[PDB]
Design a protein around this ligand. Structure first.
Ligand SMILES: C[C@@](O)(C(=O)O)c1ccccc1
Length: 167
């Protein structure tokens, strides 16, 4: 049993809810929240700017030190950093950004990072401002992630379309 509430069960291991991932993280304090990161860990907008804003910019300060030491992530890659006031850990995952011309086949590699964690609160990778098709991102998630993933979908209209269209 875990703390996640009000999710629709899609598969054995994937759950979905219309929710603000920031507000969900604040309530649950999950072991792992996933950030929709870029390779520079520059948290300006979407999931990254909002989580970063909710940490009072401490996520960005930590991230700048990580990049200064290690250099940029790979598209499809990840790193584990602090969850600050939101979670124990934040798994920063880089899905491909269609609005930068990145290979959508890298979305499966991105979701494979989730399999290193038994339970996660996450957004749909590559969806929203990353430019991919959200129905596609949910399909790749279901077909790639084997650990227990609780997906928060910000847009009520999109949530209803994802549920209604789910195979
Ligand atoms: C915040 C967001 O990235 C999400 O994860 O739901 C998002 C996706 C799609 C439309 C609006 C917002």
């Amino acid at each position: 049993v875990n703390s996640f509430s009000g999710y629709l069960k899609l598969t054995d291991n994937v759950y979905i809810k219309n929710a603000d991932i920031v507000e969900e993280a604040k309530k649950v304090k999950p072991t792992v929240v996933v950030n929709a990161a870029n390779v520079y860990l520059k948290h300006g907008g979407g999931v990254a700017g909002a989580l970063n804003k909710a940490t009072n910019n401490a996520m960005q300060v930590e991230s700048d030190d990580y990049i200064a030491t290690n250099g940029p992530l790979k598209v499809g890659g990840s790193c584990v950093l602090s969850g600050h006031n939101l979670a124990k850990h934040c798994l920063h995952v880089v899905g491909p950004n269609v609005n930068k011309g990145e290979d959508i086949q890298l979305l499966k590699s991105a979701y494979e990072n989730f399999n290193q964690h038994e339970v996660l609160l996450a957004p749909l990778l590559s969806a929203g401002i990353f430019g991919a098709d959200p129905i596609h991102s949910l399909r790749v998630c279901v077909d790639t992630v084997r650990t227990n993933v609780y997906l928060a979908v910000f847009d009520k209209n999109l949530y209803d379309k994802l549920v209604s269209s789910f195979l």
